[PDB]
Amino acid sequence: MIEAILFDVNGTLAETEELHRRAFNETFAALGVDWFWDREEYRELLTTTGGKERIARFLRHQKGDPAPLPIADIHRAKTERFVALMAEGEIALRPGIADLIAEAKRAGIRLAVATTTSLPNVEALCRACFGHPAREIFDVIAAGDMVAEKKPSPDIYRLALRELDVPPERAVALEDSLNGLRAAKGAGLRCIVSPGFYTRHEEFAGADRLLDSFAELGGLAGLDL
Numbered sequence: 001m002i003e004a005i006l007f008d009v010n011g012t013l014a015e016t017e018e019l020h021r022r023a024f025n026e027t028f029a030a031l032g033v034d035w036f037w038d039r040e041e042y043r044e045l046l047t048t049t050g051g052k053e054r055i056a057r058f059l060r061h062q063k064g065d066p067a068p069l070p071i072a073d074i075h076r077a078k079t080e081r082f083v084a085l086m087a088e089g090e091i092a093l094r095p096g097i098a099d100l101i102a103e104a105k106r107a108g109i110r111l112a113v114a115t116t117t118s119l120p121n122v123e124a125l126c127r128a129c130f131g132h133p134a135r136e137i138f139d140v141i142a143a144g145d146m147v148a149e150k151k152p153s154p155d156i157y158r159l160a161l162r163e164l165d166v167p168p169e170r171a172v173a174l175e176d177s178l179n180g181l182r183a184a185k186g187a188g189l190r191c192i193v194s195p196g197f198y199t200r201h202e203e204f205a206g207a208d209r210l211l212d213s214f215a216e217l218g219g220l221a222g223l224d225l
């Protein structure tokens with residue numbers, strides 16, 4: 001059996017990206033700029049992880065209004081919006097996720113998050129979906145700007161593994177996206193993928209398992225081999 005499970009957040013714990021998109025767009029509108037990311041645009045922008053990095057990519061060549069604030073300030077406002085939206089309880093965990101975490105806890109298996117997303121989003125999602133602070137759910141939280149290079153860099157996973165003190169051969173990652181799979185694999189981890197809306201078009205070569213739902217894992221034993 002594995003000794004630790006490392007979870008991605010967006011698209012893994014919950015289907016969140018349309019809520020991120022909303023938060024971006026509503027922030028743009030509040031700032032009085034003409035920017036608006038439709039699904040087609042957002043699907044492409046999602047291949048750059050981290051909201052600051054995504055905004056920067058967009059600004060490099062978009063031909064609408066110039067940024068009126070630093071990126072970090074735009075992103076901070078977006079995060080406050082996302083947190084507020086997340087709290088409303090419209091988003092639930094993806095099927096299978098709650099049950100896996102409960103089984104892991106009963107088995108004494110160590111749990112981490114390993115995410116590109118801002119730390120407040122992790123807290124918001126945990127409070128909403130689990131009813132507790134994130135550090136009551138996960139033993140280790142590796143998020144956001146804790147590393148210099150985001151997925152597909154393995155660095156966030158290497159951070160999480162160091163903090164867990166579990167060798168990669170005894171752990172497993174759950175992911176939804178190709179950049180996530182690449183990051184996990186680059187850290188030496190077996191990786192179970194279940195994609196979503198934005199990510200299903202991707203090919204997931206090297207995934208240990210590729211599932212339509214985490215409810216198909218089959219319990220902790222499905223994380224083995």
Ligand SMILES: O=C(COP(=O)(O)O)[C@@H](O)[C@H](O)COP(=O)(O)O
Nearest residue numbers: 008009010049050051115116117118
């Ligand atoms: O690329 C990401 C995927 O998160 P994960 O690694 O959990 O799949 C994030 O940048 C989110 O799109 C937005 O969150 P922020 O705006 O907070 O970055």
Ligand SMILES: [Mg+2]
Nearest residue numbers: 008010011176
């Ligand atoms: Mg993800």
